[PDB]
């Protein structure tokens, strides 16, 4: 398991949590020095449990698929909650079984569905450590509309930060003040599967992407990523989604 406590949290303790999260994800292989997530894991071992504590010390446990870093559901006291999707239903077979009741959320866990349920795109939802505190608090008691927004914050401050060093740094900057994600942040989130694929295809193509990936940079300018010498690849991306799962 991994844990993160918002009480006393700072850029350093948040960095440690993201480190812990990354290190909890198994890999047999590194590709261009980036850990390659596994094609599959059988049984309960597929799911990492993240214990998150709000400023007041109240807690939720979040179930994360270790092959793709996908949040499946969470436990809040004696109630489990799962996305309305086959992968999450499968997860419910293995995690939080001892909950007194299981609620299926009235949406799947993808960004498009969550944004619809929340009534807001990510571009308009501030993120940061304070936002994460709010999200944990929201998830403690069932409210499907509020939960969609909370989940958008949760996903970006945990899984997306784990995937990209840039996103981790962005959350660190938002340790005491929330701010909407940068256009670069949104770009990276949207491109993880694409980037993972191209980095893997580059292995037998002399480090050249079979198809270039279009990204937005920190200055807000639209770059094109064509090979593994790119800063995205050498410094930013921290985990690779296995091409078997693309």
């Amino acid at each position: 398991d991994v844990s993160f406590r918002l009480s006393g949290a700072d850029p350093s303790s948040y960095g440690m949590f993201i480190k812990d999260l990354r290190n909890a994800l198994p890999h047999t292989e590194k590709v261009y020095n980036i850990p390659l997530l596994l094609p599959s894991v059988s049984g309960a071992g597929r799911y990492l449990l993240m214990h998150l504590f709000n400023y007041d010390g109240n807690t939720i446990t979040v179930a994360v698929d270790v092959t793709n870093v996908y949040i499946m559901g969470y436990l809040a006291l004696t109630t489990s909650y799962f996305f309305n999707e086959p992968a999450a239903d499968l997860a419910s077979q293995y995690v939080f079984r001892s909950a007194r009741r299981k609620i299926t959320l009235p949406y799947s866990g993808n960004y498009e569905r969550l944004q619809i349920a929340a009534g807001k795109p990510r571009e308009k939802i501030p993120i940061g450590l304070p936002a994460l505190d709010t999200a944990i608090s929201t998830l403690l008691h069932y409210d499907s509309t509020a939960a969609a927004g909370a989940l958008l914050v949760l996903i970006q401050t945990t899984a997306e930060a784990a995937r990209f060093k840039y996103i981790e740094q962005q959350i660190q900057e938002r340790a005491y003040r929330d701010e909407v994600p940068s256009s670069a942040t949104i770009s990276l989130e949207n491109s993880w599967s694409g980037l993972s694929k191209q980095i893997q295809l580059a292995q037998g193509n002399n480090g050249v992407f079979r198809t270039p990936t279009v990204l937005v940079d920190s200055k807000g300018n639209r770059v094109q990523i064509t090979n593994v010498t790119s800063n995205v690849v050498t410094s930013n991306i921290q985990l690779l989604l296995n091409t078997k799962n693309i």
Partner: peptide, 6 residues
């Protein structure tokens, strides 16, 4: 690799 805000 880049950084701040947005």
């Amino acid at each position: 690799s880049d950084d701040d805000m947005g």
